């Protein structure tokens, strides 16, 4: 009966600047069980991404990084969408480039 | 400096597929160096650091072979645990294992580990004496009795005291540039004004290795952790880490607040304030 | 290197 919801951070590897190549990351952690879907969105649609190898922390909870090379610019909006048994609907977390 | 070699297994049953999902990942300190994924097209143990290419094809073949056998072992374990708990084969369950060794600067075994988790809880653990076990409940007491009757602890203790410590030494030499570094965080405070009365200060620490770091906020030798948001440390994606600590302060009082960053790559703790420009 | 599990030592 142990079900822990994911925590999500969305962020660029480097401080972002228009027309400079970069990497977009969605780190998803603290979750259990391990089945999970993690999609990077560009303007609300799925872009191609790669995902790190399933690993876990001391309390058994899992963590994954979903990542894609991207070139930020003034128009494009990014987000990460996560589906998990503990979430009644998919959770979308917007990339806040001004944090 | 002390160091660790750790492996992490995750087995996930998959009702109505031929096999569970079995994943192994290995780490030296906070760097991932190998993986195995039973779902790959041709499952093999693979390097996750360039300096692992120093190991020849026997290394890869052997790690691959034991991973496959490990996958079979986990399949049987998952079945047995469901039996102990009267859990239907229709439902998915998760077995997890962490194991490895810590070595001191002196290069010798400081501590060995072997711990199992079942559906996210502690199940069975090898004690620090490396000869007795701790079972979380009566199911795990069945597993404990099996491990005792099989003499499992002895074989694992031999690995830890020999192979584990010896290979960690080798990995530490082959990846010395990656592994023996202490990259201090680059730190700065940024300002985020919601209104003319309140502003959020965010203390950022970027590009640091290893993972352990302390970010705290102070007003006047007075610690602010009750008001601060501290995010979990996150990966850069390129072998380093990132973290921040934010707190809401009154507009015009920004200079009353200091961020203190402590990290192994720093000669002294950084103390920072938000700086115009 | 990692540790080989053996079937005779089973949960």
Residue numbers in the entry:
A (entry chain B): 1 to 99
B (entry chain A): 1 to 277
C (entry chain C): 8 to 18
The authors write:
Here we describe the peptide binding properties of the common and functionally important cattle MHC class I allele, N*01301. We also describe, at atomic resolution, the crystal structure of N*01301 bound to an immunodominant 11mer Theileria parva-derived peptide, Tp1214–224.
The P1-Cα/PΩ-Cα distance of 22Å is typical of pMHC complexes and, as reported for other 11mer peptide complexes, requires a substantial portion of the peptide to bulge out of the binding groove. In the N*01301- Tp1214–224 complex the bulged conformation is tethered to the binding groove at P5 and P9 with residues P6-P8 prominently exposed at the pMHC surface. The peptide conformation appears to be relatively rigid (the electron density is well-defined for the full-length of the peptide) and is not the result of stabilizing interactions with neighboring molecules in the crystal (the peptide does not contribute to any major crystal-packing contacts). Electrostatic potential calculations show that the central region of the N*01301 binding groove displays strong electronegative potential, augmented by Glu114 which is involved in a H-bond network with Glu97 as well as with water molecules present in pockets C and D. Glu97 points up from the floor of the groove to hydrogen bond to the Lys side chain of P5. The bulky Trp73 residue thus appears to play a defining role in the location and stabilization of the P6-P9 bulge conformation. Overall the binding of Tp1214–224 to N*01301 results in an interface of 1040 Å2, one of the most extensive interface areas for canonical pMHC complex structures reported to date. The results shown in the present study indicate that the very prominent C-terminal bulge of the Tp1214–224 11mer when presented by N*01301 and the highly stable nature of the structure, are likely to be key factors in determining the dominance of this epitope over other parasite peptides bound by N*01301.
